[PDB]
Amino acid sequence: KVFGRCELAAAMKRHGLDNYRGYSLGNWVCAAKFESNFNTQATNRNTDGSTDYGILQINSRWWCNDGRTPGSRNLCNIPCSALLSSDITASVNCAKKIVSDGNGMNAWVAWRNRCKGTDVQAWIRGCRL
Numbered sequence: 001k002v003f004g005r006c007e008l009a010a011a012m013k014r015h016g017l018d019n020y021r022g023y024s025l026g027n028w029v030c031a032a033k034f035e036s037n038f039n040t041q042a043t044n045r046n047t048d049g050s051t052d053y054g055i056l057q058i059n060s061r062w063w064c065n066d067g068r069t070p071g072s073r074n075l076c077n078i079p080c081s082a083l084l085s086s087d088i089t090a091s092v093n094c095a096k097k098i099v100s101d102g103n104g105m106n107a108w109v110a111w112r113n114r115c116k117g118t119d120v121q122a123w124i125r126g127c128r129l
């Protein structure tokens, strides 16, 4: 599923992300935009053999099991495939775990380089929230 900007904003808001660990809604929407272009089915393979999955491009070496990443942790205790669903519940619950680990949203490369220090508030412009 390819989410609309406002649509996603609303879905994240209802799932508890507006201001989760001090990160405003604009941050999450912006991160999703640059990570997967709002596509829940997005996948990307990395040099270390791990793969990034879904709307938040969650990594298989740390957060989910895809049965193909060698010496992997499955911190969210979930098959990576579960993160490619139209229902973002899995992704958001995993994200909550990630953002609370110590590097905050810096865990999202796209976020660090294209969202951090920008006016993320623009991402929720015109939304009915």
Ligand SMILES: CC(=O)N[C@@H]1[C@@H](O)[C@H](O[C@@H]2O[C@H](CO)[C@@H](O[C@@H]3O[C@H](CO)[C@@H](O)[C@H](O)[C@H]3NC(C)=O)[C@H](O)[C@H]2NC(C)=O)[C@@H](CO)O[C@H]1O
Pocket (backbone or CB within 6 Å): 056, 057, 058, 059, 060, 061, 062, 063, 098, 101, 102, 103, 107, 108, 109
């Ligand atoms: C969205 C996504 O998957 N992004 C990937 C990042 O998760 C990943 O970064 C690494 O995250 C792990 C777990 O949060 C970092 O580990 C922990 O670091 C904290 C303090 O920084 C410490 O308290 C924990 O002991 C330690 N956990 C373990 C089990 O070691 C790790 O430092 C992050 N890596 C770096 C270089 O900062 C990166 C890298 O695989 O990929 C993103 O795609």
